[PDB]
Ligand binder design. Structure first.
Ligand SMILES: O=N[O-]
Ligand SMILES: O=N[O-]
Ligand SMILES: O=N[O-]
Ligand SMILES: [Cu+2]
Ligand SMILES: [Cu+2]
Ligand SMILES: [Cu+2]
Ligand SMILES: [Cu+2]
Ligand SMILES: [Cu+2]
Ligand SMILES: [Cu+2]
Lengths: 334, 334, 334
């Protein structure tokens, strides 16, 4: 049918790791879902040492916000590049078909805006990212990426096709940064992005990230900003990596149902300890918490997690179950 | 039955990314399929800068040609090492059972030939590569690898077991090269392969390729050599990496049906954005084009794609579908 | 029911690649299975050059021993840290639920012991490793890891749900070591673990292992210590990597049935040439040998296998099958 006859809904995006309100099961027919994002180039402190980079962001955050729609909705994105920015940007949705995922049609100079519409024909979680010709990896590895979830119209289903319903959803975007180092191993500093570019390229070509972080910085998902849940709650964690493979693991838990490559027409993998999300992919894992306390959620290359930054915490409330685990003899001398 | 009573068919191989003519559904009983390959050691220019390596090839190309047979055919390979070559070579088929995939039985010095036969008992796409004792990774990372497709006798089937038929097939071999660098970062030059060997080994041990290319060189699958299709065509892309993990992605499309690890008795993964092909594996992805224009097919570590070379193009002809994607407001000022 | 009313069985662990005796199909009701492990910090020679590291081990071996239980058994582990050790240790089971896999409850100083019990609620093969707060990757990458197999109570089943029974089982633990190098590229030497720590951290942060080995050393699974089988035997190989992705391959064979991410409620992948086990995961592959002779089992990044050490051998006895493979014309001149 004619697109103009469809309902329109405007969505206001929220900062990761939170996700905008939506229904898992579609309560309306197919809609045009309107999103707006404003590009912001900004300084960001990415580690405990105070290393500061020039980040390139969708809507002021690394990662960009999680958009949520249903299969066969239309996504209409208004992308704004304000005059206070210096670079050309665009957007490629892996969820979309044609024109380099939209990138060929969304090139915006500072001071310009554009509106793209596409039909979300395939259910799953998908990466989106900036991809300006000749400079793709630089923009992506400076923070300019996020994800979109296209839910099946009747929600998520298990390996047997029975309903799976989540109580909470979180979005973890994992970012590999490549801060240029001198011969001594110190991080170089640059006046302008153009003076940064070649050294940025040389650093990228090492294929060795200097930092690998969740939600834009070392420790971003810890402390007061730890993820939360209660014993018995069903949590969906959507995890994306636009450029580099990752291997999420919940320390003390499991992925009860996992779409490691993120596409909901496939049956989920059951009972995973660790799962592989290839670079350029988003995945989703569903877990029901069974024990309280602190959990760490990590990239299980443990160097990547505990030295380069790819670690966050869940604080879980509720009853301790001694049947599942107990200290029989607490640590003591002999 | 006695092998001598079977039909024999001789196949003449073609240069990747093209594939020799074959039937998807087997029109004959089990056959002996005869292939011939001639080893050629040659200089190859691998990048825009004119970096020239001593390549080791099957049949003059990187990758070697795609062989296609059906499940329970016999593959009879005549491998020729002419006297103009300097090194010992052999061949290991991952499709074969026994004798290190044939490698124990096919060692040929310059001036020698050998004929191996094996039964293709398992359907799938499989790597083949050179593997001379004591020097395996050097030969493999100098170009000496390809793939073989063993089709099910009744062709490919979807996740529900209905027929899937491809209209075109392409073979992308992805090659990681490790050109030795000095302390300054320049590529070293060597008189003979023996003088090259240790520096080749040290470069390999960095685990950081200097180049990652499709069809033997940066830009080999672009421009006049872009892959082609039309809107509505069903295309199979077979992709191999003998040594290093890769993560293919069609920018602007999907893998509608994907055998990421390449073995056809398993149901395909549906609707993939990006898929992981482990080093030492061949995979296959089937896509029906729905939009015209240029597509890029990339390793979605984007540094690997756009800086080290792992990117090619499809040029697709046909009708633009405004329902699937459209520019609502073209990029403009405010 | 009350745990005290269950049967108890004490198991005596064996050195990898061998596995303690067990039944595939559970011959008793749910039990408490008692294991004891003693931490041993020791010097280990890891390569042909005689490079010696200070290893941190469970029970004196790298990897630690494979524990085998059935789904819904209880695992009771007595962990002993003798006074001859210098460091704090603990244990995290990926098989367990809660308290960081047990790590929060098992911290033992030299001279102390502890007993943990957990319920093995999920069938599969799982990593266990040391994880002391603030120093996780160092302990894990110094050898302190192993695996546990939780069999389904009715044993393993194929993709159709018919029984699969193994005749032999082997455990290959793959270890990535990061020996610190100076500016010249020589391996540094250290008096105490505390003087080693920062250089250990800097080496880890390169993300480039210096050694990647099976069973604790280059060539540990070769020669007199080669794995063995006979033609016709069904062999299960359990393979773990606590920190880094690997891609096992049996040269001359296949993975007939593969749980690449190791969890037995999922159907196995069939006919794999090579499979990906993500860092932080254990996998399992079942193969029936069809040809005699020497096989190599390798990480199929071939640099990792043949230069850094991730290669072992099987010696297989029995009848040669000329139908599956034969030399038609043995290597000769022209
Ligand atoms: O943008 N990645 O967090
Ligand atoms: O040989 N690989 O393109
Ligand atoms: O501990 N890994 O062999
Ligand atoms: Cu941008
Ligand atoms: Cu992309
Ligand atoms: Cu060769
Ligand atoms: Cu191989
Ligand atoms: Cu320890
Ligand atoms: Cu762990």
């Amino acid at each position: 049918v004619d697109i103009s006859t469809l309902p329109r809904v405007k969505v206001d995006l929220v900062k990761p790791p939170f996700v905008h309100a939506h229904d898992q099961v579609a309560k309306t027919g197919p809609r045009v879902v309107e999103f707006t994002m404003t590009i912001e180039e900004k300084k960001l402190v990415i580690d405990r040492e105070g290393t500061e980079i020039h980040a390139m962001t969708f809507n002021g955050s690394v990662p960009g916000p999680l958009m949520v729609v249903h299969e066969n909705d239309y996504v209409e994105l208004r992308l704004i590049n304000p005059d206070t920015n210096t670079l050309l940007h665009n957007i490629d949705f892996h969820a979309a078909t044609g024109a380099l995922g939209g990138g060929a049609l969304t090139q915006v100079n500072p001071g310009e805006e554009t509106t793209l519409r596409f039909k979300a024909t395939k259910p799953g979680v998908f990466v989106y990212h900036c991809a300006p010709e000749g400079m793709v990896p630089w923009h992506v590895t400076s923070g300019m990426n996020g994800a979109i979830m296209v839910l099946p119209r009747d929600g998520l289903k298990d390996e047997k096709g029975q309903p799976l319903t989540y109580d909470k959803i979180y979005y973890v975007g994992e970012q590999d940064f490549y801060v240029p180092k001198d011969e001594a191993g110190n991080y170089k500093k640059y006046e302008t992005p153009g003076e940064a570019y070649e050294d940025a390229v040389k650093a990228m070509r090492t294929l060795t990230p200097t930092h690998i972080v969740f939600n834009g910085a070392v420790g971003a998902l810890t402390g007061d900003h730890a993820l939360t849940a209660a014993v018995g709650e069903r949590v969906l964690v959507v995890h994306s990596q636009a450029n580099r493979d990752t291997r999420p693991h919940l320390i003390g838990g499991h992925g009860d149902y996992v779409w490691a490559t993120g596409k909901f027409r496939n049956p989920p993998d059951l009972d995973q300890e660790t799962w592989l999300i290839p670079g350029g992919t988003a995945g989703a894992a569903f877990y029901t918490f069974r024990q309280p306390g602190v959990y760490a959620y990590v990239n299980h290359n443990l160097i990547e997690a505990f030295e380069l930054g790819a670690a966050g915490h869940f604080k879980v409330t509720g009853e301790w179950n001694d049947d599942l685990m107990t200290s029989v003899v607490k640590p003591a001398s002999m």
